[PDB]
Amino acid sequence: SSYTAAGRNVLRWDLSPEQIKTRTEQLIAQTKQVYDTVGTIALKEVTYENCLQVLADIEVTYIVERTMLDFPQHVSSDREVRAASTEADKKLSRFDIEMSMREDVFQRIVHLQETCDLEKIKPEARRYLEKSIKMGKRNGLHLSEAIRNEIKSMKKRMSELCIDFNKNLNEDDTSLVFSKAELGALPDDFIDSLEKTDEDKYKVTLKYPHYFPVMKKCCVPETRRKMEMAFHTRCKQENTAILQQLLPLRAQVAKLLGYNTHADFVLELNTAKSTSRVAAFLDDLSQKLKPLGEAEREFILSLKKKECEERGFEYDGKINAWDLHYYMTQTEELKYSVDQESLKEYFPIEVVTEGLLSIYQELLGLSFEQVPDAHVWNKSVSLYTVKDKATGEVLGQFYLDLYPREGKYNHAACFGLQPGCLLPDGSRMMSVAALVVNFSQPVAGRPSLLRHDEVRTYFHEFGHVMHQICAQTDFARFSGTNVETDFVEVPSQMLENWVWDVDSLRKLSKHYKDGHPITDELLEKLVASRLVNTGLLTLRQIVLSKVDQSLHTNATLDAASEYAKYCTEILGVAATPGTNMPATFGHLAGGYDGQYYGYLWSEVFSMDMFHSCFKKEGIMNPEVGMKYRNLILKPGGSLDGMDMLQNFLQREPNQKAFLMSRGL
Ligand SMILES: C[C@H](NC(=O)N[C@H]1[C@H]2C[C@@H]3C[C@@H](C[C@H]1C3)C2)C(=O)N1CC[C@H](c2ccccc2Cl)N1c1ccccc1F
Ligand SMILES: [Zn+2]
């Protein structure tokens, strides 16, 4: 029955470190047997059934069992359990590298593609075939046993380099000391939170919750100059030496695999296809954003002439790198004047939850229902069952993990826990997602309360949840959010547009003391502040995108001298002499190198689908809402991103609604 939820979630969240250890050993041994069975099938004897189907069946089985093993490390309250889960994940990733080089299994399905008729199977089954083979050729399984052994060795070193790149940055404990006057305009809240030293000064570390208040609030420009120099010289000379190995290594592995650059290797699985497509996209957007950034630099500079005159400071006549977050925060509090704290009194969390669940149910045609006596990894976690309003089909379930505790993931995320694919016995699996965020912890005084940028995160992360749950595919590889990486953030960013709508904000806002709405003047101050500092904030995302694209196109360039080049040519705010920002850029050694363009790439598509389709036909209209559910969310990764796009807009998308978003 695809019309109940009973029996369909049996994920266990109370596993002991011993249970995790042994389930990990048993899953590796059992999955290996299937690979082993396939790889010794005579080529005369292979079928769709005994190669491609047994591979898909073990892939679903692998994914679900893995979730019980690698997810406790992110949400559990027992440290011994989070540690078994971290070790399981390491041991299971060791197993995946091993499986990625199984040429015996790769040879069996190349043969199947060679013989069997491609037009007597399902289009998605054809896709599972073609992309499993493309997978093995992107690992070089079709190549000789000699460069493969060398490619294997080269990749194990990239792994070491990437580990050490971030381990360096995380083991850093660089601090400056300051006085109460050298920390001007910073709140008593922030300064009471700081340690004091033996010469009775205030210790400010270089970590994110210390660095960013100071750069945004401190009225002493020399304190800002010192903190920015320290911030962008973190692991300066040792992470430069890692990039000098890692980036040419990516160029070399890619050329062995038949790709010109590492960026080309990455982009093949993306909707932007090529490096020149990305390059022109990024270049023709800075030419677009140029006079808007010329206007913003002009205004910020005049704020600085004003300020230095009043405070008794010298005026150099530039916006330095340690001056930008300061006067952008002034711009936010001078032009647009939204108190982001008297506004947070209007968003209590019972109300935001209830009216976010209201919007999506009405828009997509769904029915959410909380599970009573629910198995959970924590007491504070809820469970909802998701139905289709018309049929009563149970599509899936989402957990809501809202509040911060020790051991918990401290970023916002949607974890897919179960794929909405087919099961080996012909049946359908229920989708299971987890919304994991850290909204401000409830204290016995008032209700827990949300800032507007927290409502924006709630909404962003719930469209991932709906993408995961509404998706229905035949194979687990295409299930849920498993689309292109420059497309994963379209269903998320598109629904952020709702928290910038007047009518919709009223469904979320209710003062926690009576229940009188936000007034009209405040609601209008709000949605007018959508494009504060847009130019200089968007030009700085392009700088980082041009940087990520450059180091994976020409690996013979100084990373710091490229960052300097883009900072002055695109941003208009110069990189500081002596700094090395790319040596602190954790994305280059995170999993998404060559992929930074894809968050501006994805905004254009969601701006098009919102302005040309939703804003036009009514943004709560359940006919655009069902067409969005069916032609974007439902097919998952079983169709291409630009095809799902054109089935909806009924045309190739353009940047017009994106330029009209920013106001150009
Ligand atoms: C890196 C690894 N690559 C291959 O296994 N490549 C083979 C070789 C190269 C091509 C062709 C053939 C199948 C696949 C793709 C051999 C991989 O993707 N793994 C590791 C086991 C699991 C899996 C993948 C595919 C089918 C079944 C399973 Cl259990 N899968 C996996 C791991 C973590 C999460 C989700 C997953 F799905
Ligand atoms: Zn996201």
XYZ file of C-alpha atoms and ligand atoms in Angstrom:
702
model
C 0.000 0.000 0.000
C 1.290 3.409 -1.073
C -1.631 4.831 0.901
C -0.415 4.229 4.449
C 2.724 5.198 6.343
C 2.635 2.041 8.452
C 5.638 -0.254 8.063
C 7.249 2.171 5.637
C 9.615 3.865 8.086
C 11.606 1.403 10.161
C 14.735 3.515 10.495
C 16.368 2.957 13.891
C 17.688 5.959 15.847
C 18.665 4.177 19.072
C 21.591 2.098 17.804
C 24.495 1.492 20.170
C 28.134 2.124 19.100
C 28.409 -1.671 18.992
C 25.311 -1.989 16.800
C 26.622 0.666 14.404
C 30.004 -1.102 14.261
C 28.500 -4.465 13.299
C 25.807 -3.159 10.945
C 28.635 -1.406 9.109
C 30.664 -4.626 8.873
C 27.645 -6.605 7.652
C 26.575 -4.066 5.018
C 30.051 -3.827 3.504
C 30.351 -7.624 3.348
C 26.902 -8.023 1.796
C 27.155 -5.236 -0.779
C 30.589 -6.520 -1.809
C 29.099 -9.965 -2.505
C 26.678 -8.503 -5.060
C 29.472 -6.664 -6.885
C 31.510 -9.874 -6.691
C 28.622 -11.949 -8.070
C 28.097 -9.598 -11.023
C 31.780 -9.244 -11.900
C 32.172 -12.985 -12.495
C 29.186 -13.383 -14.803
C 30.222 -14.635 -18.239
C 29.608 -12.020 -20.932
C 27.645 -14.693 -22.814
C 25.315 -14.926 -19.816
C 24.570 -11.336 -18.754
C 21.055 -9.880 -18.656
C 19.255 -6.700 -17.700
C 18.059 -8.769 -14.733
C 21.334 -10.173 -13.379
C 23.496 -7.094 -13.972
C 21.567 -3.828 -14.006
C 18.668 -4.797 -11.728
C 20.713 -6.524 -9.016
C 22.929 -3.441 -9.036
C 19.957 -1.121 -8.536
C 18.422 -3.321 -5.842
C 21.602 -3.346 -3.750
C 21.968 0.409 -4.294
C 18.624 1.089 -2.602
C 19.423 -1.389 0.177
C 22.824 0.252 0.642
C 21.478 3.802 0.841
C 18.788 3.184 3.480
C 20.956 1.062 5.785
C 23.774 3.598 5.448
C 21.502 6.346 6.768
C 21.175 4.542 10.115
C 24.973 4.540 10.256
C 26.194 7.929 8.991
C 23.418 10.226 10.247
C 23.729 9.796 14.067
C 27.052 11.684 13.781
C 25.109 14.890 13.085
C 22.154 14.899 15.480
C 22.712 12.390 18.297
C 23.135 13.480 21.916
C 25.422 10.590 22.855
C 29.064 11.289 22.000
C 29.955 7.589 21.852
C 27.211 7.215 19.239
C 28.324 10.226 17.171
C 31.820 8.731 17.169
C 30.752 5.274 15.987
C 28.792 7.032 13.252
C 31.788 9.123 12.169
C 33.911 5.976 12.035
C 31.221 4.054 10.158
C 31.075 6.832 7.575
C 34.864 6.834 7.188
C 34.871 3.045 6.892
C 31.991 3.156 4.386
C 33.673 5.822 2.261
C 36.810 3.670 2.202
C 34.467 1.026 0.828
C 33.063 3.348 -1.849
C 36.474 4.293 -3.252
C 37.089 0.547 -3.475
C 33.784 -0.038 -5.267
C 34.402 2.903 -7.614
C 37.270 0.936 -9.175
C 35.373 -2.298 -9.824
C 36.224 -2.864 -13.507
C 34.715 -6.358 -13.479
C 31.256 -4.926 -12.832
C 31.889 -2.088 -15.285
C 32.781 -4.519 -18.066
C 29.507 -6.401 -17.605
C 27.246 -3.422 -18.284
C 29.234 -2.035 -21.210
C 28.559 -5.434 -22.752
C 24.858 -5.145 -21.918
C 24.664 -1.760 -23.652
C 26.429 -3.327 -26.631
C 23.930 -6.176 -27.063
C 20.426 -5.679 -25.630
C 17.863 -3.424 -27.322
C 17.839 0.010 -25.676
C 14.293 0.713 -26.862
C 12.571 -2.204 -25.111
C 13.306 -0.874 -21.634
C 12.136 2.199 -19.719
C 13.737 5.622 -20.440
C 14.950 5.846 -16.832
C 16.375 2.327 -17.057
C 18.220 3.484 -20.165
C 19.438 6.393 -18.058
C 20.643 4.144 -15.233
C 22.613 2.240 -17.872
C 24.189 5.188 -19.697
C 25.138 7.090 -16.542
C 26.599 4.101 -14.693
C 28.853 3.622 -17.710
C 29.662 7.338 -17.886
C 30.460 6.975 -14.189
C 33.054 4.267 -14.789
C 34.688 6.144 -17.658
C 35.027 9.182 -15.395
C 37.017 6.888 -13.126
C 38.958 5.478 -16.059
C 37.747 1.873 -15.796
C 37.915 1.587 -19.598
C 41.600 2.508 -19.492
C 44.705 0.402 -18.833
C 45.568 -1.109 -15.460
C 48.647 1.129 -15.278
C 47.330 4.701 -15.311
C 44.366 3.464 -13.319
C 46.779 2.356 -10.594
C 48.351 5.797 -10.903
C 45.034 7.690 -11.022
C 44.123 5.772 -7.868
C 47.330 6.934 -6.199
C 46.890 10.522 -7.400
C 43.367 10.683 -5.963
C 44.463 9.342 -2.571
C 46.815 12.312 -2.364
C 44.141 14.842 -3.290
C 42.227 13.298 -0.402
C 45.148 13.848 1.978
C 45.659 17.422 0.739
C 41.961 18.303 1.095
C 41.859 16.839 4.608
C 44.949 18.768 5.695
C 43.724 21.985 4.054
C 40.701 22.168 6.358
C 42.361 20.507 9.353
C 44.915 23.330 9.189
C 42.189 25.980 9.235
C 40.272 24.247 12.036
C 43.264 23.770 14.343
C 44.043 27.479 14.053
C 43.806 29.465 17.302
C 45.032 32.897 16.234
C 43.880 35.709 18.514
C 44.371 39.448 18.860
C 43.919 41.336 22.126
C 42.087 44.649 22.429
C 40.798 47.193 24.937
C 37.218 48.354 25.448
C 38.047 51.482 23.450
C 39.749 49.501 20.687
C 36.457 47.612 20.480
C 34.224 50.634 19.992
C 30.520 50.354 19.151
C 30.467 46.616 19.908
C 27.626 45.647 22.299
C 28.063 44.705 25.963
C 26.603 41.358 24.898
C 29.596 40.679 22.647
C 32.237 42.042 25.025
C 30.992 40.173 28.113
C 31.271 37.041 25.968
C 34.995 37.611 25.414
C 37.798 36.140 27.523
C 40.141 38.431 29.443
C 43.932 38.054 29.566
C 46.836 38.512 31.998
C 47.390 42.118 30.890
C 43.624 42.561 31.236
C 42.686 42.964 27.569
C 39.908 41.295 25.593
C 40.786 38.216 23.550
C 39.153 38.105 20.110
C 39.613 34.861 18.187
C 39.569 34.581 14.404
C 36.568 32.244 14.261
C 33.342 33.272 12.506
C 31.242 34.354 15.525
C 34.124 36.609 16.671
C 35.402 37.989 13.366
C 32.134 39.090 11.770
C 30.585 41.193 14.555
C 33.865 43.133 14.750
C 34.075 43.795 10.982
C 30.422 44.903 10.897
C 30.156 46.961 14.077
C 33.537 48.236 15.337
C 34.003 51.990 14.859
C 37.808 51.733 15.108
C 39.131 51.201 11.554
C 42.534 50.097 12.877
C 40.935 47.243 14.810
C 39.248 46.247 11.557
C 42.515 46.503 9.614
C 44.211 44.195 12.136
C 41.443 41.578 12.174
C 41.192 41.431 8.375
C 44.949 41.020 8.001
C 44.925 38.188 10.536
C 41.844 36.608 8.968
C 43.243 36.487 5.428
C 46.706 35.330 6.489
C 45.374 32.272 8.313
C 47.476 29.250 7.342
C 48.844 31.557 4.643
C 52.065 29.823 3.627
C 51.187 26.174 4.344
C 47.815 26.199 2.573
C 49.423 27.978 -0.363
C 51.825 25.041 -0.608
C 48.857 22.656 -0.632
C 47.073 24.537 -3.427
C 50.334 24.489 -5.394
C 50.075 20.686 -5.379
C 46.313 20.134 -5.366
C 45.274 22.362 -8.285
C 47.847 21.042 -10.775
C 46.897 17.542 -9.592
C 43.284 18.168 -10.602
C 44.478 19.341 -14.018
C 46.494 16.153 -14.460
C 43.867 13.601 -13.408
C 41.308 15.289 -15.664
C 43.584 15.199 -18.726
C 44.199 11.497 -18.121
C 40.422 11.061 -18.103
C 40.135 13.052 -21.330
C 39.189 16.510 -20.044
C 40.917 19.819 -20.816
C 40.581 21.273 -17.315
C 39.193 20.113 -13.987
C 36.376 22.623 -14.443
C 35.362 20.874 -17.671
C 35.402 17.547 -15.815
C 33.054 18.892 -13.197
C 30.735 20.824 -15.528
C 29.869 17.803 -17.695
C 27.412 16.623 -15.032
C 26.075 20.176 -14.700
C 23.464 22.157 -16.640
C 26.062 24.786 -17.541
C 27.888 22.164 -19.620
C 31.127 24.028 -20.367
C 33.664 26.453 -18.882
C 32.968 29.052 -21.569
C 29.258 28.945 -20.767
C 30.067 29.647 -17.119
C 32.700 32.243 -18.028
C 30.404 34.291 -20.270
C 27.621 33.949 -17.693
C 29.859 35.394 -14.970
C 31.464 38.017 -17.229
C 28.256 39.346 -18.807
C 26.722 39.702 -15.346
C 29.461 41.970 -13.975
C 29.038 44.221 -17.005
C 25.372 44.246 -16.030
C 26.053 44.957 -12.353
C 28.786 47.535 -12.988
C 27.067 50.935 -12.626
C 25.042 49.625 -9.676
C 28.338 48.806 -7.975
C 29.699 52.142 -9.149
C 26.740 53.746 -7.378
C 27.218 51.736 -4.175
C 30.957 52.427 -3.954
C 30.155 56.101 -4.445
C 27.642 56.111 -1.586
C 29.702 54.052 0.859
C 32.693 56.320 0.252
C 30.642 59.405 1.155
C 29.590 57.657 4.373
C 33.273 57.270 5.191
C 34.101 60.909 4.448
C 31.243 61.846 6.774
C 32.301 59.413 9.494
C 36.028 60.222 9.482
C 35.182 63.913 9.688
C 32.951 63.441 12.731
C 34.979 60.836 14.645
C 38.276 62.653 14.084
C 39.811 60.207 11.619
C 42.024 60.522 8.557
C 40.393 59.792 5.211
C 42.367 57.773 2.642
C 39.672 58.030 -0.039
C 39.398 54.310 -0.734
C 37.119 51.572 0.441
C 39.608 49.098 1.880
C 38.866 45.421 2.483
C 38.418 46.094 6.203
C 35.943 48.907 5.506
C 33.275 47.131 3.461
C 31.146 45.105 5.897
C 31.090 48.163 8.148
C 29.545 50.671 5.733
C 27.281 48.042 4.178
C 25.787 47.532 7.626
C 25.449 51.320 7.861
C 23.702 51.365 4.481
C 21.284 48.775 5.901
C 20.582 51.018 8.897
C 20.441 54.368 7.089
C 18.549 53.787 3.851
C 16.113 51.130 4.918
C 15.987 51.347 8.686
C 14.506 47.927 9.543
C 15.030 47.137 13.205
C 15.774 43.422 12.740
C 14.933 42.771 16.390
C 11.597 44.516 16.864
C 10.773 42.629 13.687
C 11.846 39.343 15.284
C 9.195 39.902 17.961
C 6.623 39.357 15.213
C 7.889 35.887 14.279
C 7.273 33.338 17.053
C 8.085 29.786 16.075
C 4.712 28.058 16.591
C 3.300 30.600 14.167
C 6.056 30.471 11.541
C 5.888 26.670 11.525
C 2.096 26.500 11.239
C 1.851 29.056 8.422
C 4.744 27.628 6.439
C 3.004 24.259 6.578
C -0.160 26.092 5.531
C 1.364 27.696 2.430
C 2.933 24.539 0.979
C -0.141 22.388 1.643
C -2.289 24.902 -0.229
C 0.254 25.480 -3.011
C 1.321 21.916 -3.817
C -1.904 20.107 -2.866
C -0.589 18.283 0.192
C -1.751 17.280 3.674
C 0.730 17.183 6.562
C -0.043 15.322 9.781
C 2.135 15.017 12.887
C 3.052 11.517 14.081
C 2.097 11.001 17.784
C 4.224 8.369 19.561
C 7.169 8.959 17.219
C 10.597 7.333 17.181
C 13.119 10.186 17.128
C 16.825 10.808 17.719
C 15.942 13.629 20.107
C 13.079 14.715 22.361
C 12.676 18.076 20.593
C 12.187 16.522 17.142
C 8.785 16.242 15.434
C 7.592 13.903 12.667
C 5.026 14.688 9.969
C 3.455 12.339 7.421
C 2.939 13.828 3.952
C -0.142 13.048 1.847
C -1.496 14.105 -1.524
C -4.840 15.872 -1.047
C -6.620 14.357 -4.058
C -5.600 10.694 -3.831
C -4.356 10.259 -0.268
C -1.067 8.869 -1.512
C 1.504 8.895 1.276
C 4.515 10.466 -0.417
C 6.801 10.653 2.594
C 7.738 12.082 5.982
C 9.850 14.929 7.289
C 11.373 15.489 10.705
C 11.852 19.018 12.003
C 15.051 19.491 14.014
C 14.899 23.152 15.011
C 16.938 23.972 18.119
C 20.693 23.884 18.848
C 22.259 21.405 21.247
C 25.717 19.927 21.743
C 26.881 17.591 18.972
C 24.416 18.960 16.436
C 24.949 20.152 12.855
C 25.406 23.924 13.166
C 24.401 24.798 9.606
C 20.996 24.632 7.928
C 20.372 21.468 5.927
C 17.895 19.028 4.470
C 19.048 15.449 4.930
C 17.458 12.821 2.719
C 17.056 9.698 4.835
C 14.957 7.542 2.505
C 14.657 7.799 -1.294
C 11.237 7.749 -2.955
C 12.217 5.004 -5.382
C 11.059 1.501 -6.260
C 11.908 -1.439 -4.015
C 13.155 -4.826 -5.356
C 9.792 -6.488 -4.595
C 8.059 -4.170 -7.062
C 6.931 -1.827 -4.295
C 7.450 1.891 -3.636
C 9.519 3.344 -0.808
C 8.234 6.213 1.299
C 10.408 9.334 1.105
C 12.007 10.490 4.371
C 13.663 13.864 4.888
C 15.050 15.723 7.891
C 15.050 19.494 8.251
C 18.001 20.300 10.498
C 18.509 23.919 11.560
C 19.594 25.941 14.590
C 17.023 28.653 15.283
C 17.466 30.487 18.597
C 17.029 28.222 21.644
C 13.791 28.757 23.632
C 14.396 30.272 27.060
C 11.802 30.123 29.852
C 11.192 33.876 29.597
C 9.509 34.317 26.223
C 8.636 32.189 23.212
C 11.579 31.358 20.993
C 11.592 34.080 18.331
C 12.884 34.271 14.748
C 14.648 37.010 12.789
C 13.512 37.470 9.183
C 16.751 35.904 7.919
C 15.801 32.848 9.976
C 12.400 32.686 8.275
C 14.288 32.878 4.988
C 16.357 29.864 6.042
C 13.313 27.911 7.242
C 11.719 28.489 3.838
C 14.892 27.712 1.886
C 15.416 24.419 3.687
C 11.785 23.308 3.385
C 11.798 23.463 -0.415
C 14.595 20.941 -0.288
C 12.309 18.822 1.884
C 9.489 19.148 -0.649
C 11.919 18.364 -3.469
C 12.951 15.213 -1.615
C 9.414 14.077 -0.776
C 7.510 14.985 -3.965
C 10.159 13.215 -6.055
C 9.179 9.801 -7.440
C 11.644 7.792 -9.531
C 12.310 4.163 -10.493
C 15.971 4.107 -9.440
C 17.507 5.345 -6.182
C 20.257 7.237 -8.021
C 17.701 9.657 -9.486
C 15.515 9.844 -6.373
C 14.937 13.014 -4.372
C 17.388 15.902 -4.534
C 19.829 13.927 -6.703
C 19.804 16.420 -9.576
C 22.652 18.527 -10.976
C 24.629 20.581 -8.478
C 23.896 23.852 -10.259
C 20.226 22.874 -10.028
C 19.863 21.530 -6.460
C 19.337 25.051 -5.133
C 16.536 26.063 -7.509
C 13.665 24.472 -5.533
C 15.175 26.033 -2.405
C 15.811 29.563 -3.617
C 12.471 29.860 -5.397
C 10.488 29.571 -2.186
C 12.603 32.204 -0.446
C 10.619 34.534 -2.697
C 7.563 33.938 -0.507
C 9.053 35.654 2.554
C 9.406 38.792 0.441
C 5.684 38.814 -0.320
C 3.299 41.072 1.605
C 0.243 38.783 1.866
C 2.401 35.751 2.668
C 4.325 37.496 5.476
C 0.980 38.060 7.204
C 0.486 34.291 7.304
C 3.705 34.038 9.304
C 3.718 37.183 11.431
C 1.799 37.422 14.697
C 3.044 39.426 17.676
C 3.672 37.080 20.606
C 1.988 39.428 23.103
C -1.436 40.067 21.606
C -1.374 38.857 18.012
C -1.525 42.135 16.166
C 0.247 41.966 12.794
C 3.287 43.869 11.612
C 2.089 47.293 10.522
C 2.032 48.465 6.900
C 5.011 50.837 7.201
C 7.177 48.085 8.672
C 6.073 45.470 6.138
C 7.013 47.893 3.381
C 10.357 48.821 4.924
C 10.948 45.075 4.914
C 10.319 44.114 1.284
C 12.083 47.278 0.072
C 15.221 45.974 1.763
C 15.444 42.953 -0.538
C 18.039 44.779 -2.616
C 20.155 46.630 -0.072
C 23.788 46.323 -1.159
C 22.829 43.910 -3.979
C 25.480 45.086 -6.444
C 28.480 44.791 -4.134
C 27.107 41.565 -2.625
C 26.527 39.981 -6.028
C 29.794 41.262 -7.504
C 31.576 39.555 -4.606
C 29.932 36.220 -5.378
C 31.182 36.580 -8.938
C 34.705 37.313 -7.662
C 34.669 34.027 -5.755
C 33.127 32.305 -8.778
C 35.763 33.708 -11.145
C 38.374 32.592 -8.614
C 37.018 29.027 -8.314
C 36.752 28.844 -12.092
C 40.268 30.191 -12.663
C 42.173 27.823 -10.359
C 40.479 24.899 -12.112
C 41.198 26.174 -15.624
C 44.765 27.462 -15.410
C 46.515 25.812 -12.459
C 49.764 27.696 -13.124
C 48.471 30.977 -11.695
C 49.038 32.444 -8.242
C 45.715 32.003 -6.429
C 46.238 35.209 -4.454
C 47.117 37.235 -7.557
C 43.954 36.060 -9.315
C 41.854 36.982 -6.288
C 43.550 40.381 -6.292
C 42.872 40.774 -10.018
C 39.136 40.079 -9.709
C 38.696 42.140 -6.532
C 39.775 45.289 -8.392
C 38.313 44.535 -11.827
C 34.901 43.287 -10.674
C 34.334 44.388 -7.075
C 36.207 47.697 -7.080
C 37.429 46.931 -3.567
C 41.106 45.942 -3.529
C 42.528 42.796 -1.947
C 44.868 43.735 0.910
C 48.653 43.545 0.280
C 50.093 40.585 2.189
C 46.897 38.512 2.335
C 45.933 35.150 0.872
C 42.162 34.687 0.783
C 42.193 31.482 -1.323
C 44.368 29.923 1.411
C 41.335 30.280 3.686
C 38.774 29.396 1.008
C 37.424 26.118 2.397
C 35.211 25.461 -0.623
C 38.245 24.584 -2.758
C 38.970 21.648 -0.444
C 35.329 21.027 0.323
C 33.433 18.859 -2.134
C 32.337 21.658 -4.457
C 35.442 22.867 -6.264
C 34.687 24.174 -9.767
C 31.075 24.630 -8.689
C 30.786 28.009 -6.936
C 29.040 29.581 -9.949
C 26.035 27.356 -9.326
C 24.326 29.468 -6.665
C 24.003 32.471 -8.974
C 23.235 30.035 -11.783
C 20.326 28.631 -9.779
C 18.948 32.032 -8.747
C 18.353 33.064 -12.362
C 16.194 29.988 -12.979
C 14.130 30.466 -9.823
C 13.671 34.167 -10.575
C 12.349 33.248 -14.010
C 9.937 30.625 -12.675
C 8.674 33.053 -10.014
C 8.200 36.263 -12.024
C 7.084 34.748 -15.341
C 4.893 31.985 -13.925
C 3.973 32.531 -10.267
C 3.878 36.307 -9.913
C 1.936 36.375 -13.176
C -0.652 33.665 -12.507
C -1.010 34.205 -8.766
C 1.622 32.980 -6.326
C -0.792 30.826 -4.326
C -2.463 29.392 -7.436
C -2.728 25.579 -7.109
C -2.443 25.055 -10.874
C 0.963 26.647 -11.222
C 1.633 24.971 -7.887
C 0.821 21.479 -9.148
C 2.706 22.070 -12.401
C 5.691 23.074 -10.277
C 5.228 19.932 -8.190
C 4.992 17.672 -11.255
C 7.545 19.024 -13.754
C 10.284 20.194 -11.370
C 10.053 18.219 -8.131
C 8.474 14.872 -9.058
C 10.816 13.546 -11.787
C 13.826 14.056 -9.495
C 17.109 13.498 -11.303
C 15.519 11.155 -13.834
C 15.273 14.036 -16.321
C 17.746 16.799 -17.170
C 17.497 20.143 -15.392
C 16.988 22.290 -18.490
C 14.347 19.890 -19.802
C 12.349 20.045 -16.576
C 12.777 23.810 -16.893
C 11.430 24.017 -20.439
C 8.501 21.705 -19.658
C 7.399 24.386 -17.217
C 8.267 27.789 -18.708
C 7.440 26.282 -22.111
C 10.585 28.017 -23.392
C 14.311 28.435 -22.787
C 14.861 30.508 -19.625
C 16.487 33.952 -19.626
C 18.178 36.336 -17.191
C 15.472 38.986 -17.617
C 13.583 38.329 -14.377
C 16.954 38.048 -12.639
C 18.070 41.473 -13.853
C 14.657 42.823 -12.906
C 15.065 41.223 -9.501
C 18.176 43.293 -8.768
C 16.641 46.191 -10.689
C 18.603 46.564 -13.923
C 31.643 5.651 -5.199
C 30.816 4.388 -5.533
N 30.919 4.057 -6.945
C 30.558 2.868 -7.438
O 30.126 1.977 -6.712
N 30.662 2.623 -8.783
C 30.270 1.375 -9.450
C 31.307 0.927 -10.515
C 31.443 2.011 -11.626
C 30.070 2.244 -12.334
C 29.594 0.898 -12.982
C 29.453 -0.205 -11.868
C 28.405 0.260 -10.836
C 28.861 1.590 -10.155
C 29.022 2.687 -11.278
C 30.823 -0.401 -11.161
C 29.336 4.591 -5.184
O 28.678 5.415 -5.809
N 28.745 3.752 -4.283
C 29.466 2.583 -3.737
C 28.375 1.696 -3.207
C 27.043 2.341 -3.702
C 26.481 1.766 -5.013
C 26.611 2.464 -6.250
C 26.109 1.962 -7.433
C 25.438 0.729 -7.476
C 25.281 -0.006 -6.277
C 25.801 0.519 -5.067
Cl 25.548 -0.465 -3.653
N 27.390 3.775 -3.853
C 27.023 4.698 -2.922
C 27.866 5.156 -1.860
C 27.405 6.106 -0.943
C 26.095 6.628 -1.058
C 25.252 6.191 -2.100
C 25.717 5.239 -3.013
F 24.885 4.857 -3.978
Zn 20.430 24.752 0.286
